[PDB]
Amino acid sequence: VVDPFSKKDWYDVKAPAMFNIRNIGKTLVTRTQGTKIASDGLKGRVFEVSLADLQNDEVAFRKFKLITEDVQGKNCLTNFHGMDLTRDKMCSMVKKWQTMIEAHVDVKTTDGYLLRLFCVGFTKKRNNQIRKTSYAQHQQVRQIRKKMMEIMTREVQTNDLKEVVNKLIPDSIGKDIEKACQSIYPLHDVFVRKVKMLKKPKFELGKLMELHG
């Protein structure tokens, strides 16, 4: 019988260089003992941090996943892992008497980062509209989904992770989708709701220090 919290060390986590707020929080791990080391125990840790706590003045319904991969002594260096929207915003966007459109791709960046993107589009009621439903036909939905798919494809194959994360901080893809789909059926709530990561290449330190300065 002994206190197990007397053998812990408080580490720090740092965001990569494309984020404004460098310091996120503090995580802790047990001390090094024999075969197991505190460097390995901080390896597979994913942090669910909001965009408002990682940037200065932006939207509060956006979150980013950051995973550590190396440590240099009381500082855990993180990298982009994923993107998701907050549950309350996604539930409040979905309402009755409108139809919603889903598209997804498996687009790859110019390096070995395989990404999976998700987005969403809800139909817009006009200002002078008397009708209640305002639905969309199936061919218009297919054309809008193909437009979304090609807009997803065109912004990623000519970029690597840094400026596409810089593009993912605002909804510039969402504004481009909403602007391009106006001739088909006008949308009003378009947000990139989920970004995953399928494949990851070999670990290179030089890109990590270029992604932190």
């Binding site: 907050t86 309350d88 009755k96």
Partner: protein, 101 residues
């Protein structure tokens, strides 16, 4: 005798609809027959919102809401005081109870 113009549901030219499950119960009820109730609520009530706001890091922070859809079977809905019986001449009223508060 026949009680309603419809058959207690919203099926007119279909013949078959997908079934759903009750939330207070586990009965397999058809989707257009079950009494549905989309309820929206805050995480905190009106008493604890001041206690949450005084112990918050962010000033002028918007409290999130909770979104849930409820599917009720007929006996479960009438036993939970969601819908009750009414008069023969008042059974044809389609409008909901008023949203005064």
């Amino acid at each position: 005798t026949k009680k309603r113009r419809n058959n207690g549901r919203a099926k007119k030219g279909r013949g078959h609809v997908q079934p759903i499950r009750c939330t207070n119960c586990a009965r397999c009820v058809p989707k257009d027959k079950a009494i549905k109730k989309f309820v929206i609520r805050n995480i905190v009530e009106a008493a604890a919102v001041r206690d949450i706001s005084e112990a918050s890091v962010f000033d002028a922070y918007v409290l999130p809401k909770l979104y849930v859809k409820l599917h009720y079977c007929v006996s479960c809905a009438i036993h939970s005081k969601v819908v009750r019986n009414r008069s023969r001449e008042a059974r044809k009223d389609r409008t909901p109870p008023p949203r005064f508060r």
